[PDB]
């Protein structure tokens, strides 16, 4: 577990978000992309507005942030950018559903989002091992000196957020998303979905985690495009690691077959992304704008495929 300098955590402490972004950042389609030096700042901002300025000692919280930063790796996609992008989408979901989520949930979900791919190497998991590792990394960072941002909580408050965070992180394993979303489909339609049921809560939170994880598909077209190149630059670098031992990479992880990508995107939107946001919109109607953006980008990929 690496840790931040004093100057890193102190630098975050003096950050103020510039005002011109104050409305942007509440938008589901907000792109953090242009603002690299602000990304830790942005996360402080979001925590402050979702959970309140007096929810974590500023000090330990900046300590936590800058250190989580240093346990991400400088790979194309599963890096610090993605963790802040994921966090932000969760912030937007929290903001438009405020009355449904407990304080304990709101703090745990933002932190878990930030930590969701901790120490990702960029190579494919190809049971939920990666996610269980991510959660363990999160425990390590928490255990560190001056780093336990939950110190001001009770024994059962603590032993409960840790659990909200474990479940959240695990839920980011797309293999589990399918059965969970199916499960949620059934419940909702039978009318048997109970938010007062803790196990049902966990299911919905699962879907939220997926919806955040994948939120690159819900940005503006110019942004959605550039971000596809980032994910793909990792499949390909892994496929190269296949080639280097004469192995054939599956055709997604071969950068020779580069013009496969828009069809791959369309497939993925149809099989994975649209259902995800579809169901989420149904359980949480204020997240509609994610579904709309996803559809808009689906429609763009068709045009590339049809050569327009």
Ligand X SMILES: Cc1cc2nccc(-c3ccc(Cl)cc3)n2n1
Contact positions vs ligand X (CB under 6 A): 174, 214, 216-217, 231, 264-265, 268
Q: Which of 8, 31, 117, 234 binds Zn ion (CB under 5 A)?
A: 117
Q: Is 117 annotated as a binding residue?
A: yes
Asked if residue 8 binds Zn ion (CB under 5 A), the reply is no
Q: Is 263 annotated as a binding residue?
A: no
For 264-303, letters b (16+ CB in 10 Å) and e give: bbbebbeebbbbbbebbbbbbeebebbbebbbbbbebbee
- Considering beta carbons, is residue 101 or 269 the nearer one to ligand X? 269
Q: Is 116 annotated as a binding residue?
A: yes
Asked if residue 300 binds Mg ion (CB under 5 A), the reply is no
Contact 76, 234 (CB under 8 A): yes
Q: Is 160 annotated as a binding residue?
A: no
Task: Compute, in degrees rounded to 10, the torsion defined by CA atoms 277, 278, 282, 287.
Answer: 30
CB of 115 to Mg ion, least distance (A): 10
CB of 265 to ligand X, least distance (A): 6
Catalytic residues: 78
CB of 172 to Zn ion, least distance (A): 6
Phi/psi at 56 (nearest 5 deg)?
A: -145, 135
Asked if residue 210 binds Mg ion (CB under 5 A), the reply is no
Phi/psi at 250 (nearest 5 deg)?
A: -50, 150
Asked if residue 213 binds Zn ion (CB under 5 A), the reply is yes
Q: Is 88 annotated as a binding residue?
A: no
Measured CA to CA, the distance from residue 259 to residue 91 in angstroms comes to: 35
Write out the two tokens for 293.
């953006």
- Which of the listed partners (ligand X, Mg ion, Zn ion, none) does 214 bind, with a CB threshold of 5 to 8 Å by partner kind? ligand X
Measured CA to CA, the distance from residue 53 to residue 102 in angstroms comes to: 16
Contacts with Mg ion in 163-192 (CB under 5 A)?
172
- Considering beta carbons, is residue 31 or 117 the nearer one to Mg ion? 117
Measured CA to CA, the distance from residue 15 to residue 45 in angstroms comes to: 9
- Considering beta carbons, is residue 72 or 268 the nearer one to ligand X? 268
Asked if residue 117 binds Mg ion (CB under 5 A), the reply is yes
User: What number of residues does the chain have?
Assistant: 308
Closest CA to 148 of 161, 133, 167: 161
CB of 78 to Zn ion, least distance (A): 6
Contact 227, 78 (CB under 8 A): no
Residue nearest Mg ion, CB atom distance:
117
Please enumerate, by residue number, every residue annotated as part of a binding site for 3',5'-cyclic AMP. 78, 265
Please enumerate, by residue number, every residue annotated as part of a binding site. 78, 82, 116-117, 213, 265
């Amino acid at each position: 577990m690496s840790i931040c300098t004093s100057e890193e955590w102190q630098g975050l402490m003096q950050f103020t978000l510039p005002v011109r972004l104050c409305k942007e950042i509440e938008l589901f389609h907000f792109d953090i992309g242009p603002f690299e030096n602000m990304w830790p700042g942005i996360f402080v901002y979001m925590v402050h507005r979702s959970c309140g300025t007096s929810c974590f000692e500023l000090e330990k919280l900046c300590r936590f942030i800058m250190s989580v930063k240093k346990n991400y790796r400088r790979v194309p996609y599963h890096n610090w950018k993605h963790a802040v992008t994921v966090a932000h989408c969760m912030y937007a979901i929290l903001q438009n559903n405020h009355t449904l989520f407990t304080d304990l949930e709101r703090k745990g979900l933002l932190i878990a989002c930030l930590c969701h791919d901790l120490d990702h190497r960029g190579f494919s998991n190809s049971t939920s091992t990666m996610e269980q590792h991510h959660f363990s990394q999160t425990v390590s960072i928490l255990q560190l000196e001056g780093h336990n941002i939950f110190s001001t909580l009770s024994s059962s408050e603590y032993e409960q957020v840790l659990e909200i965070i474990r479940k959240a992180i695990i839920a980011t394993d797309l293999a589990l998303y399918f059965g969970n979303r199916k499960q949620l489909e059934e419940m909702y339609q039978t009318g048997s979905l109970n938010l007062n049921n803790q196990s049902h809560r966990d299911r919905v939170i699962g879907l939220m985690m997926t919806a955040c994880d994948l939120c690159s598909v819900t940005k503006l077209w110019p942004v959605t495009k550039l971000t596809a190149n980032d994910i793909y630059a990792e499949f390909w670098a892994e496929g190269d690691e296949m080639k280097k031992l004469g192995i054939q990479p599956i055709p997604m992880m071969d950068r020779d077959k580069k013009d496969e990508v828009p069809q791959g995107q369309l497939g993925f939107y149809n099989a994975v992304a649209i259902p995800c946001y579809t169901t989420l919109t149904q359980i949480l109607p204020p997240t509609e704008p994610l579904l709309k953006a996803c559809r808009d980008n689906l429609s763009q990929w068709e045009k590339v495929i049809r050569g327009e």
